[PDB]
Symmetry: C6
């Protein structure tokens, strides 16, 4: 895959906020900290309300490429 | 051997394609570039902000394995 | 592909109208123009009304084998 | 296919009526005419009615293994 | 740690006639004992019980499941491998 | 596998409680006992009511990776 590697690699190093849409329709958000041939490591640091104050929770989840339908970043970018 | 050309045709000829996903989602745009396992689809979305229409370029990396069918706008013959 | 490549070559060369059922339910109709190891190119003249006249549209769609469940030809076929 | 081939090759030989359940919940009944590495030619000997006349078709649909969840034969069978 | 786990787990599930639940991705639950498996299918035997003319009838049911349609396989009792 | 095996292996070594989301929507909780190229052996210790007292039931599923949506660890995990 001579395009997928650059593209992710780009999105990761430039810390590009992305939406990962899953085949089951679930939308993940956040940044590609890392990836390999079969998985993306995706960190999202969304805000949260814990007992009437604003906490920010950083859950990082490994998402299987084979369950991703599309990867639509927040801003377009190009490869080396 | 059929896939690459059909794609590579649509890419260079930059014909707008409708690519239906397995879940039924219909994505439209132009094939900027494709890979063994992914298609980079380019589209210019239209948004309404403060009355007037504003547009920008959205680029989607689409996994081939979530795609069912690809319907181009106009039929195309291979090279 | 002892059974597949013939059963499509026979379907392709003999221009048999085929139903393609997709895993997701939606049914495609039309003739196999051409296929490779992962895709089928299915061409189909349709029947459309625009401005009170039956107009026919020839639509060609590359359909990923991996979204296909079953392909049912219009008339029984044989191979060598 | 130490197990899959023998088993499939059995049910074609002994012309064993099989139900094939697809991943999407579809159930096909029929006899395994042929199969290869990725596909199964399922012959269905199905009666039906057309406008108050019994009409018996014989349809040979090619099924992609990747759409099959389970194949359930009508009689228990075994192989070497 | 490549393909060491799948066989041993299955292979001791089969060899020790352990009852297993097989959950298909589509949400179907299949119960039975693993008779055998290759790289791509497991052969699941169970005994089905129907009623014919108001008397019990046991039948042996043996179905070939594709692993690519299996989500998870949960034995009825803990097992361990070599 | 330069990210997946490491990420998995430290989830396993540090007995991190993990939630495994399936493509079909099912959430599986537990911890990675072992994992393969294609399966995760996931152990779950849950409390179950037996005869008016509470008893922990240990359950161990072999999960197929290809049915896994996403792997959400209980807490952050940094690899070597």
């Amino acid at each position: 895959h001579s395009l997928q590697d650059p593209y992710l690699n780009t999105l990761r190093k430039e810390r590009v906020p992305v939406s990962i849409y899953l085949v089951n329709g679930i939308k993940l958000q956040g940044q590609i900290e890392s990836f390999d041939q079969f998985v993306i490591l995706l960190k999202n640091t969304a805000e949260e309300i814990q007992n009437g104050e604003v906490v920010r929770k950083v859950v990082s989840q490994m998402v299987y490429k084979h369950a991703i339908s599309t990867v639509v970043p927040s801003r377009p970018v190009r490869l080396p």
